Symmetry: C2
């Protein structure tokens, strides 16, 4: 037993990371088959980033202006195109380590692992959530752009995120692998408002189920509630409204524990109103929202990859 | 910027995991050169585990009684020996994916990544600390025994932990890769007391430095203290006593931030005495002790591996 914030095994993604250099800017790329995917702002200086015209900047670039290095091998660039906010560099070699993969656009509140990289080399792996306001709270220094987020399903890597920007507020913004930003963000160094963020209610409930499975039960109370009553409380505490779809996704955890979803809602309501009184749940002194119902089931049932 | 509990990239270790079966017990092994390393309790049934005589049980086993599977390849066992609490199965093939590696016995309070595995297949990676009482607070289900903990230094994997036991209290015990338990534990299903645990003070101070670097500063106060005065408070709150060795290891973070170590001690003293008043530090509502000073520097300076 026990419950940890576990990332996916990173090896299939490590084999896809490369370094991309254009003029004096270096960041990370993702090499799948004969295409390298990277943030289009690889073509910008710090000064360009204040107000970039990506079309005009890219016209000044030829195939030979992109240096792509896979460990020690230089790749030969034979094509370049811009798709939304990503560059696709066609190269003359297929990556021999390409895994089974898909490109996925995830929903707010879904989780994924980030392989943080610098100069095309991996430094670490961690699990995070796409916030309801389409930011992520990552760990990203200068040079981490082009680092990717992913999920694995047995032998298939679903790439969902490419890192582009740190907002002036210190949270992180990026794209899907088609180059479409999550949320209202642009690849420009300017003031950019993130929405009001909210807590991912269905994830907190999943994590309360994980706690019960692990024996952490002190928070279970004598009350029930309604979906409408609970949602009045969710509004006050800036929690996402719970829907029947969310109730349905929690079904298996309800079944395993014998705790009706609305009973678990009443327990959460009491924690929102009364706080935790200096107590912990699964070693946390706040309500955790970075585990999906699918994450809890995976971890509690020991699902493996290959 | 930002600060996450980051694990090492797991690919070099993924290539070393194999499945070991003896009679009707299956768990994980680690294949390095022509040796597979696994918990000796692979030779026990559930019933044997109550009071095992490992010497007598192992005598009943021959090379052909150990089934070792690397993905789909069966390995041929040509030798077996017991070293403390590990079995070393000599096999007739060197692992082509063996990384540069060492075997290290870590100190209480040091951190490492765990690759959780079932049936020789990786499920996830997470970072944890060896507790001062030589337990770990992991995520380990039935079949996870033989999963390993490690650190990476550029291209070299330092293996420090192999998982053996869940104690009746739900924390986790294991060995170094020479088969010597961390702490007083044995590979027997019996009541086993873990010591009183303590908080890893030098790690909490490292994490307060990480917070300041990231802009989380509200906890900095007007006071200083002495090593002896601080340690009186450390005793009361079950924190490890701080030594000059610990002060010296914090030197670089002191230098970077311009906050003397004893000033940061006085800030910590005030947090121990007054609590956090419903506030957070790096998104935590408790004092975090799973980052070493070396972890903070690594993460804050973007060190990479290969």
């Amino acid at each position: 037993s026990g419950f940890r914030k576990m990332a996916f095994p990173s090896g299939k993604v490590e084999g896809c990371m490369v370094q991309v250099t254009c003029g004096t800017t270096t960041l990370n790329g993702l090499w799948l088959d004969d295409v390298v995917y990277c943030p289009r702002h690889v073509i910008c200086t710090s000064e360009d980033m204040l107000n970039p015209n990506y079309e005009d900047l890219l016209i000044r670039k030829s195939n030979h202006n992109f240096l792509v290095q896979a460990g020690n091998v230089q790749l030969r660039v034979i094509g370049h195109s811009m798709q939304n906010c990503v560059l696709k560099l066609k190269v003359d070699t297929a990556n021999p380590k390409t895994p089974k993969y898909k490109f996925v656009r995830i929903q707010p509140g879904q989780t994924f692992s980030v392989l943080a990289c610098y100069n095309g080399s991996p430094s670490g792996v961690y699990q995070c959530a796409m916030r309801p306001n389409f930011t992520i709270k990552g760990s990203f220094l200068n040079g981490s752009c082009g680092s990717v987020g992913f999920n694995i399903d047995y032998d298939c890597v679903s790439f969902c995120y490419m890192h582009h920007m740190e907002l002036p507020t210190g949270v992180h913004a990026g794209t899907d692998l088609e180059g479409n930003f999550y949320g209202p963000f642009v690849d420009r160094q300017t003031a950019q408002a993130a929405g009001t963020d909210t807590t991912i209610t269905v994830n907190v409930l999943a994590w309360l189920y994980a706690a019960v499975i692990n024996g952490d039960r002190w928070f279970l109370n004598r009350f029930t509630t309604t979906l409408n009553d609970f949602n009045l409380v969710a509004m006050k505490y800036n929690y996402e409204p719970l829907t029947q779809d969310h109730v349905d996704i929690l079904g298996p955890l309800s079944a395993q524990t014998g705790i009706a979803v609305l009973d678990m809602c009443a327990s959460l309501k009491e924690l929102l109103q009364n706080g935790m009184n200096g107590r912990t749940i699964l070693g946390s002194a706040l309500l955790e929202d970075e585990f999906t119902p699918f994450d809890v089931v995976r971890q509690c049932s020991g699902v493996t990859f290959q």
